[PDB]
Amino acid sequence: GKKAPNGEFAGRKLKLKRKKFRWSDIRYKRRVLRLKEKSDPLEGAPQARGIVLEKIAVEAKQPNSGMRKAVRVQLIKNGKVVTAFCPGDGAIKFIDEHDEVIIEGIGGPKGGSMGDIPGIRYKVVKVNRVSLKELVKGRKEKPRR
């Protein structure tokens, strides 16, 4: 007998087996409880605006060294401290301290910061409801306050 009971009336055993053994998929367990949804702030969401507390630059990882542009932003309803990775070359410039900065994830919600960056779970898109890739190109719009 390769595992399983096989027999007309047994099925229930089957039926509980699977479920018992389903909870060894971390991902499945996690969603079905909602640990994905509780822990890594957002309250689950696509994105979150937040006030730029300051600008900080951190070091790169193991084979690497280079100053990544990171913000510290506070999500507003979430009310949680988030350090964050900023796309683009010049950028850290166009972000004034205490402009609104909308924030997203970057590269699988699992926790995985991209290979270079240690911490950074997240991405920035915006400065005063106009984005960073729009501010890398000179023409498209340029910033205020």
Binding site: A57, S65, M67
Partner: protein, 95 residues
């Protein structure tokens, strides 16, 4: 013809004050501040840097008053040249 590199831009002379381990050293800088400084791997594999050495420090663009990279370490003869040229003082070296 002796030639000795000099700090450029916002770089500063500094005297290494303490080895902190793993490519980090505290450096007493010519602006009177101590900075916690990284030795880049490229420099780490070229020179031996010790407490008391005179170095060039590049302050980081953020927390410029507290952090930097060591970008050059002077030899003793170069230190003597810098003294003679007035780029540093003996009082600064000794601390």
């Amino acid at each position: 013809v002796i030639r000795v590199p000099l700090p450029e831009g916002n770089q500063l002379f500094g005297v290494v004050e303490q080895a902190l381990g793993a490519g980090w050293m505290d450096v007493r800088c010519e602006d009177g501040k101590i900075r916690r400084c990284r030795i880049p791997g490229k420099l780490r594999r070229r020179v031996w840097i010790r407490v008391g050495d005179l170095v060039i420090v590049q302050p980081w663009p953020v927390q410029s008053d507290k952090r930097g990279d060591i970008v050059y370490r002077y030899t003793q003869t170069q230190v003597d040249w810098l003294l003679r040229k007035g780029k540093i003082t003996q009082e600064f070296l000794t601390g």
